[PDB]
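Task: complex structure prediction.
Instruction: return C-alpha cells for all chains below.
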Amino acid sequence: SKSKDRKY
Amino acid sequence: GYKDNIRHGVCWIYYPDGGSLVGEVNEDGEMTGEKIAYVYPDERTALYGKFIDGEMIEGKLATLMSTEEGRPHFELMPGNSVYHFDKSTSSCISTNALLPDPYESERVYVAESLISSAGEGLFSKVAVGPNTVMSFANGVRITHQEVDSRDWALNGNTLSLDEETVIDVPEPYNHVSKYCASLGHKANHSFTPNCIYDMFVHPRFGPIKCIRTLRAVEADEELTVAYGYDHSPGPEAPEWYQVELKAFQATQQ
Ligand SMILES: Nc1ncnc2c1ncn2[C@@H]1O[C@H](CSCC[C@H](N)C(=O)O)[C@@H](O)[C@H]1O
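Output:
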C-alpha cells in the first residue's frame, strides 16, 4: 500500500 | 447527599497509550460534567472542563498540580486556550489548523532535517526518557483505495491508521504556515529509528497515531521513525526509500 505503517 | 461511597468519588479511566479521563462519573458511569478532564501521558498536562460521555466539549488548558485522595487538583493556564473534540473528516483536517497541541508544543519543534535532501524534520525540545509520546500524527481520513490508486508523488506522508483508513496531510497543510495543530507528519524515516508510530486516542483529534520514543532522546536530537512500506508486495515505496533500504541491507552484511 502507498502509505506508512500498515500491518501486513 | 455527600457521603464516603463510590457514587461520590472520582474515577480515572486510562487508555492503553497512557492518557486518561478523570472526574466524577454520572449515574450511568459516564464522564459527563463541567469538571471532567483529559490528562495527557505526562500525567501533568490536562484539558479540563465540559465533557459529555468522555467527549471534550470545552477543555481549558490546565496543569495537574497534585492528587488528594485520588482527586485531581488543577491549575488553569493563562491565555483562555480552549479545545474541543474535532476529529478530521475526508475533507477537513481541523477547525483550528493553526492552533498547536499544547503537550506537543513543549516537546518537539520543526527544523531542517540532518538527513541530506530530506526537507524538514522533527526535533526534541528537551531530554526525554524511553516510551515518551512526543508528537501526534493527525490528518484527513481517506481510503486505502484512493491512496493506492494515485501517484506516489501524492503519498509522501500518507499513514495507515487501520485496514479501513489512511491519514493524509495533503498540500498545503504539509507546510507549518498552513497547518501546525499536530506535527507528527514532520518526522523523517530511518531504518535505525529512535521512535515508533504507536496508536493514540486524542481528545481533540480522536483515534490517531503518535510518535513515541524507544529510548532516551537528548534535547535537539532528530526524531525518526520507520515508515514501514512493504518490501515484498521489489518494494512498493518511493525511490529514496528503496535506495536507503539497499544501503541498510548492505550494513547488515
Ligand atoms: N530518510 C529519508 N531520506 C530522504 N527523504 C526523506 C526521508 N524521510 C523522509 N523523507 C522526505 O520526507 C517526506 C515525508 S514527510 C516527513 C517531513 C518532510 N521531510 C517535510 O519536510 O515535510 C518524503 O516524501 C521525503 O521527501
